[PDB]
Design a protein around this nucleic acid. Structure first.
Lengths: 145, 58, 37, 175, 215
RNA sequence: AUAUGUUAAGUGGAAAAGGAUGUGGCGUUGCCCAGACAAC
RNA sequence: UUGGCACCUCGAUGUCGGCUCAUCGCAUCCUGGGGCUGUAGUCGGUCCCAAGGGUUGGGCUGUUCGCCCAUUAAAGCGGUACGCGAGCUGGGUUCAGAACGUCGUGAGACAGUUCGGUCCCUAUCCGUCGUGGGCGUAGGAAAUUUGAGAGGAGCUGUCCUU
RNA sequence: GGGAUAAGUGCUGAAAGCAUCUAAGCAUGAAGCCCCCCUCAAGAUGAGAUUUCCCAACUUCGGUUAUAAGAUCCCUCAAAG
């Protein structure tokens, strides 16, 4: 007897959250956020529809590293031109454009499908303590760890 | 899929799937993983009562 | 400066230290200064 | 840490105020402050200060002798002060003041101008002897080294800027 | 000195005092007027916008670019001016001068000023081979069969593909070119021309865009 | 996830003879406050 | 590099040197920064950092290689099917003719010399150089623009003063 | 020309009552790295910004018309092909 609930687009209700990346470790914040961008923390989780919530990371210039990672955590970016390999350390990438640091770390934990691409478009990283989306009325989340 | 849904439902009562299934076995309950996740979807109170018995058997 | 895999005291006044994770020696005469590499 | 446990720190008319993280020192030439440490705490019996280290970790007993020495140097500098004197050796080598700044003649096709910095006082004795007076030991040492690195001593005749008591290994290279 | 637009007339020569020959380009720059002025509060960056030479007024059934259309009419009328053919922005100037509607005259420059000129180079069609890339011919002789083709393009196996910068035939054409550190030889206020020392990009009667030199 | 410890090298995640005050564990034996172990 | 092995290809993976055009490594030839010197000065020797740019015309040989003549700041060493023949040549060598030396009773042979000796192909797909049509960008247009990103450039001598 | 670095040179400084460029701190230092210089660049589907121009009814709004600003077909051409 086949009786398993599947979610539709007329079933799903996505809500908004705010994470504070202040005094947190990159990666350890990123995996917990990645699990929320997908509906993994929900019953009614269905794998062929998008059933996750929106996230906002606010401070994101206060993120932390543990080792000597800030001087040798190069990133490496090729450009498809002969000898066109480029480079930047993790330390200088959070000094300039800290938003691309966290965004890229979280998107690397999502599947590379047509649905993973759409799920990663709910991220909204900012540097500093304020964000524009007051009209969506987001709550705080308080990472589990 | 059923195990993913049960795991999500158990974290809302501060348990992981692992310990919930251990406790349910020690309580003697023999409900499927397929039924355990349909209950958690349709009837939240019944699932709460299951969780309390699983907690008391540990 | 001598750069060799085998660094040893040649003096009796030569001294072995570690700087930035590298073994070196230092005497007053600059011929005896070495570092491991 | 023998030097760390041997924390006398006998003050003077200098007053020693604490702000927890950093410390400020006022005196005849004071009002210079420095951030010391976190895990180490101080105690002032009547005026004198003594340092105490927690947990006897090697990191703690290494930071002990350092925090004890930095406070000593920063309070003893406002009281008395620091000085470093260096001498010029060579034919025609002369330097004299331009008020607060200093220009030098050491055999280049141009004189060298090294303008002064805060809390530092240059003074030339006889166009061949230069001293630096100040309250910060590290800053005095930094500038004394920077003005020396303009023309260090060479080993065949000894010409070049030289510390007042520096021994200079001299070679004998005949034509 | 700061910035002006003009048309390229042609080349001549001038005798400098001490009697030396100076090749020179005649640039005619009349009817320069300041249109809109952009600010960092409204736009994010400071600049002025200049229009060069005036076209005719709006006509009901115009069919060429000789008459202004309604949006250009309105824009050029917000500052009390006639419509223009060419419009460019200058970011190197000081924006606190230049009231909107001013006329930028040719004597803002003076003889002896070092300038940079920016035109569109002139128009060579599909020419590609040894003309586009300054490449060598093969022999014209002993047994050749290889004269004006390009050489090899790549290697074997290892690169089973060409590469992204390979130089192949495909139209010389009309890029934008800046020539740096030229010089103003003489300014003529009644005829409204500037004599620039040397030669500048483009065909006759094209737009030139003089600016003060950045170096 | 529960206990105990080791590593600071991103070692972990490619190799030797040799070299070296890097730091834990375990013993035997010297000089110990009558005063060494250094500086003067 | 000379080899050892015989795993892909014998219903074909078809060629040494040169030409045209490159691209990468650094174990650095020049130019930049340093330590030691048995470095007086001018020159050098040796080691350390460093791959941005640069790195020549002839005579003799099919020649790679090499010798020589004149320069130059310098005339680096390697990988790319010993880079590159659906881009070129065809001097050399494994084709039929002929001759010399030598070996063979002979027909012939050498890997020894020497003269002569046919280089096919209208580009479908990826790749690369240029150049257009369609739709999208929460109304439709005209013009002026920010710059996430990407490419280019990056060499060096002599003389005069101190 | 600015910023950060390599080999190297340092200042203060303990561990280790001395010493020590290093372990906390503070400087300096290459035609190399990032900018500064030149060109392209919002299909940057994250599709950005500014100034100006234009604005309708029927209607079963199912769509039908007719249009506005603005383009194009067609024709005379070259500084373009």
């Amino acid at each position: 007897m086949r009786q398993t609930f599947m979610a539709n687009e007329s079933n799903i209700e996505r809500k908004w959250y705010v994470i504070d990346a202040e005094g947190q470790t990159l990666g350890r914040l990123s995996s917990e956020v990645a699990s929320i961008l997908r509906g993994k923390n929900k019953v009614t989780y269905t794998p062929h529809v998008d059933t996750g919530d929106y996230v906002i990371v606010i401070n994101a210039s206060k993120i932390e590293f543990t080792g000597n990672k800030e001087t040798d955590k190069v990133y490496y970016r090729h450009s498809n031109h002969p000898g066109g390999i480029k480079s930047i350390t993790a330390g200088e990438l959070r000094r300039t454009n800290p938003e691309r640091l966290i965004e890229n770390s979280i998107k690397g934990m999502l599947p590379s499908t047509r649905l993973g691409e759409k799920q990663g478009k709910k991220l909204f990283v900012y540097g500093g303590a304020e964000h524009p989306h007051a009209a969506q009325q987001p709550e705080n989340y308080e990472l589990r760890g | 899929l059923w195990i993913t849904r049960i795991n999500a439902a158990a974290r809302q009562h501060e348990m992981s799937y692992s310990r919930l299934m251990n406790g349910l076995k020690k309580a003697g309950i023999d409900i499927n993983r397929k039924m355990l996740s349909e209950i958690a979807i349709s009837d939240e109170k019944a699932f709460a009562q299951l969780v309390t018995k699983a907690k008391d058997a540990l | 400066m001598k750069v060799r895999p085998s660094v040893k005291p040649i003096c009796e006044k030569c001294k072995v230290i570690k700087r930035k994770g590298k073994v070196m020696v230092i005497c007053e005469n600059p011929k005896h200064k070495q570092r491991q590499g | 840490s023998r030097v760390g446990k041997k924390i006398i720190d006998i003050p003077s008319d200098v007053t020693v105020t604490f702000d927890g993280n950093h410390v400020t020192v006022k005196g005849p030439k004071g009002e210079l402050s420095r951030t010391l440490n976190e895990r180490m705490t101080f105690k002032q019996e009547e005026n004198t200060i003594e340092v105490v280290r927690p947990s006897d970790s090697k990191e703690d007993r290494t930071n002990h002798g350092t925090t004890r020495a930095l406070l000593n140097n920063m309070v003893q500098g406002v009281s008395q002060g620091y000085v470093k004197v260096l001498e010029l050796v060579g034919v025609g080598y002369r330097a004299q003041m331009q008020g607060k700044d200093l220009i030098l003649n050491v055999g280049y096709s141009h004189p060298v101008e090294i303008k002064a910095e805060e809390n530092i006082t240059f003074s030339v004795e006889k166009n061949t002897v230069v001293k630096v007076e100040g309250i910060s030991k590290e800053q005095v040492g930094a500038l004394a080294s920077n003005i020396r690195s303009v023309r260090p001593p060479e080993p065949y005749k000894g010409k070049g800027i030289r510390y007042q008591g520096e021994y200079v290994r001299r070679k004998e290279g005949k034509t | 000195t700061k910035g002006i637009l003009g048309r390229k007339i042609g080349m001549t020569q001038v005798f400098g005092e001490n009697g030396e020959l100076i090749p020179v380009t005649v640039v005619e720059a009349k009817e320069n007027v300041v249109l809109q002025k952009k600010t960092v509060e409204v736009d994010g960056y400071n600049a002025i916008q200049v229009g060069f030479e005036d076209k005719k007024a709006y006509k009901k059934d115009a069919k060429s670019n000789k008459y202004a259309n309604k949006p250009a009419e309105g824009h050029a009328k917000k500052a009390d001016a006639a419509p223009k053919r060419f419009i460019r922005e200058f970011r190197n100037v000081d924006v606190d001068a230049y009231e909107v509607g001013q006329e930028v005259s040719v004597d803002t420059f003076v003889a002896g000023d070092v300038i940079d000129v920016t035109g569109v180079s002139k128009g060579k069609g599909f020419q590609g081979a040894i003309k586009r890339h300054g490449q060598s011919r093969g022999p014209m002789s002993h047994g050749s069969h290889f004269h004006r083709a390009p050489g090899s393009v790549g290697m074997a196996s290892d690169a089973s593909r060409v590469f992204k910068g390979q130089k192949m035939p495909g139209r010389m054409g009309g890029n934008t070119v800046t020539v740096q550190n030229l010089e103003v030889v003489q300014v003529d206020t009644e005829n409204k021309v500037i004599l620039v020392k040397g030669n500048v990009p483009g065909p006759k009667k094209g737009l030139v865009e003089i600016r003060t030199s950045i170096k």
